């Protein structure tokens, strides 16, 4: 109980990802807009910016 500072344990989580071409499942909270066709615009399709 009254152990040293370094002697105290630490619960560590090492969760990792895999950024590749496969269909993504877990993503951050954002929104979506309409899709224009004949217009040079910026796109952020599934991470591909």
């Amino acid at each position: 109980p009254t152990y040293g500072v370094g002697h105290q344990p630490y619960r560590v989580v090492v969760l990792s990802f895999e950024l590749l071409h496969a269909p993504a499942t877990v993503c951050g909270p954002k929104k979506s807009t309409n899709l224009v066709k004949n217009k040079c615009v910026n796109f952020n399709f599934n991470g591909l910016k």
């Binding site: 969760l15 499942t25 877990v26 951050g28």
Partner: protein
């Protein structure tokens, strides 16, 4: 460390800016990504551990 807890989660809209108010001394050493940048990228699958 003897028995891992690997939970391969599925599709969701989990906001990674939720554990920013965790227990004191919450280090974030991302070797390959950025901590504050985890709010716009769409990851394929996350492999958690314990």
């Amino acid at each position: 460390v003897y028995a891992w807890n690997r939970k391969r989660i599925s599709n969701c809209v989990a906001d990674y800016s939720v554990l920013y108010n965790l227990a004191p001394f919450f280090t974030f050493k991302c070797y390959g990504v950025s901590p504050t940048k985890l709010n716009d990228l769409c990851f394929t699958n996350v492999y958690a551990d314990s």
